[PDB]
Design a protein around this ligand. Structure first.
Ligand SMILES: Nc1ncnc2c1ncn2[C@@H]1O[C@H](COP(=O)(O)OP(=O)(O)O)[C@@H](O)[C@H]1O
Ligand code: ALF
Ligand SMILES: [K+]
Ligand SMILES: [K+]
Ligand SMILES: [K+]
Ligand SMILES: [K+]
Ligand SMILES: [K+]
Ligand SMILES: [K+]
Ligand SMILES: [K+]
Ligand SMILES: [Mg+2]
Length: 438
DNA sequence: TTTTT
């Protein structure tokens, strides 16, 4: 599909030489595309020893991986390293993975906290009896620190400040050619100006001119980016509430042996929704990796709701809980090829909080769907969007404007609402980082 | 005001 540039090939060459490194570049410079090639090559060599990870769930799906937290076995990794190590040792699946890992890839490194990275460093050494940096694991960090910083409640501790980073990262390589907006050089200039936070008048004016409504085909739906979840949930709601069709309500079956409030506080953070509201034609996103083609993050469109089964050791212990309501959603999913579709009948799935031995502590049964329509700027980081409307109203964080506006392929498929330079800012420590790279 | 099980 894609020929790697000579810059992309040079990075790949360094990674295959075993050097622990961080490679960076502006939004859309082909970092993740290269990363997928790195993965393929590194896995010919170490078939079971390449750990693919990203800071967020959606950015991990973009490279066929899992979150950094999920790879570790940390849960949230909040306590002290002495306790985190015991927890990981109880998870014999994660403990084995820590010892069999040869390369650790972390995409979207900007959102990885340096304190988390220092714990991962100490845990790597301990579990592997290896005093090398990261216990001998080759660290491959990939991302852009002008993009979103680690999420906080200076408290913000960037990854490049950690002692782990300084003793492990041996080389930094910068990709310079921007592919996502390559057709529009002015657009690239405007996006680049946002990086350091200083926005010239012409760039600011050129973004305000994008407030014009987008005109799209009948079936082309533009993605909506917002800073907060309230907006995302409201934007999904208003879109659903305009569709007629007597909205179908799917309540989740929530069980568990944990006491309260612990059980409620665990369920609150499940991606699967407690109440899934669906109409006909509602935009949706799959949140489970079913197939090699239909994976977590795949966008789709619901066409109908009926199945009385006619439309043609623990598993059983969990099938009893499946009352099967009466009706499954019929959803047509745009496959990861851009054009073709695949319609499938979406069955309910189970998400479990468990203990290392296998005893499920909390269970939620729900269809693996969320009304997609809208999306947080945080979760957009890493995505490419052909047609997108960005509402900068509640932007509160450094690099959030830059990430949001840089998701677009072109200005013709981008609408910007409530643009303001006050919303465009970068962290002092990020700017000094990139200026020291000389 | 966001993300991470
Ligand atoms: N070498 C290349 N040639 C052509 N297009 C590319 C190349 N590398 C990346 N792209 C395109 O650029 C877009 C963004 O690339 P991505 O890997 O998401 O960059 P980053 O991760 O740095 O944002 C993708 O749609 C991809 O198809
Ligand atoms: F740097 Al990106 F999508 F990962 F623009
Ligand atoms: K050893
Ligand atoms: K041009
Ligand atoms: K100016
Ligand atoms: K213009
Ligand atoms: K059900
Ligand atoms: K907003
Ligand atoms: K700001
Ligand atoms: Mg990327």
């Amino acid at each position: 599909m894609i020929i790697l540039s000579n810059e992309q090939e040079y990075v790949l060459k360094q990674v295959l030489s075993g050097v622990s490194l961080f490679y960076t570049g502006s939004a859309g410079t082909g970092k993740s595309v290269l990363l997928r090639s790195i993965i393929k090559s590194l896995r010919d060599k170490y078939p079971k020893g390449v750990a693919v990870t990203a800071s967020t769930g959606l950015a991990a799906c973009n490279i066929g991986g899992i979150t950094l937290h999920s790879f570790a076995g940390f849960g949230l990794g909040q306590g002290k390293v002495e306790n985190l190590i015991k927890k990981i040792k109880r998870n014999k699946k994660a403990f084995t993975r820590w010892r069999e890992t040869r390369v650790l890839i972390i995409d979207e490194i900007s959102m990885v906290d340096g304190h988390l990275l220092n714990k991962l460093n100490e845990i790597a050494k301990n579990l592997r009896r290896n005093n090398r940096p990261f216990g001998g694991i080759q660290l491959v960090a990939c991302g852009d620190f002008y993009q979103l910083p680690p999420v906080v409640k200076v408290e913000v501790f960037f990854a490049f400040e950690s002692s782990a980073w300084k003793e492990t990262i041996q080389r930094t390589i910068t990709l310079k050619e921007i592919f996502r907006q390559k057709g529009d050089q002015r657009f690239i200039d405007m996006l680049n100006n946002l990086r350091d936070g200083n926005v010239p008048d012409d760039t600011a004016r050129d973004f305000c001119r994008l407030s014009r409504p987008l005109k799209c085909p009948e079936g082309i739906v533009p993605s909506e980016l917002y800073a907060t979840r309230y907006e995302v949930d409201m934007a999904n709601s208003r879109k659903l509430n305009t569709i007629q069709g007597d909205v179908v309500v799917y309540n989740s079956v929530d069980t568990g042996i944990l006491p309260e409030p612990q059980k409620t506080q665990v369920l609150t953070n499940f991606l699967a929704p407690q109440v899934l509201n669906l109409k006909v034609g509602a935009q949706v996103m799959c949140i489970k990796n079913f197939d090699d083609q239909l994976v977590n993050g795949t966008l789709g469109k619901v066409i109908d709701f009926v199945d009385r089964d006619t439309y043609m050791s623990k598993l059983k212990d969990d099938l009893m809980k499946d009352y099967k309501n009466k009706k499954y959603p019929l959803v047509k999913f745009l496959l990861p090829d851009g054009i073709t579709f695949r319609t499938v009948v979406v069955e309910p799935e189970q998400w479990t909080t468990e203990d290392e031995d296998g005893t499920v502590l909390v269970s939620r049964i729900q269809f693996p769907l969320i009304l997609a329509w809208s999306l947080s700027i945080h979760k957009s980081q890493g995505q490419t969007l052909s047609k997108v409307v960005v509402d900068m109203k509640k932007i509160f964080e450094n690099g959030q404007a830059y990430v949001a506006l840089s998701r677009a392929v072109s200005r013709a498929g981008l609408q910007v609402l409530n643009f303001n330079r006050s919303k465009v800012a970068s962290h002092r420590k990020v700017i000094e980082f990139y200026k020291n790279l000389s």
